[PDB]
Amino acid sequence: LETFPLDVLVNTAAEDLPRGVDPSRKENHLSDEDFKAVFGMTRSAFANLPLYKQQNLKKEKGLF
Numbered sequence: 001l002e003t004f005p006l007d008v009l010v011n012t013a014a015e016d017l018p019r020g021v022d023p024s025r026k027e028n029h030l031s032d033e034d035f036k037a038v039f040g041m042t043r044s045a046f047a048n049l050p051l052y053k054q055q056n057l058k059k060e061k062g063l064f
Contacts, residue, residue: 002020002021003031004021009026009030009063027054
């Protein structure tokens with residue numbers, strides 16, 4: 001599991017995203033500290049939200 005800075009996952013052009021990052025699950029590539037800061041819940045709780053809600057939260061945060 002490769003981890004990258006929040007700014008890299010939010011602002012890197014799609015064509016330049018590190019090859020190992022799943023574009024549909026950018027949040028999995030945040031450090032634990034950044035996931036906590038960005039989502040405010042555990043990774044498990046976030047994954048337990050309906051996918052549409054995970055997506056909607058991510059859209060506002062630039063991680064969709």
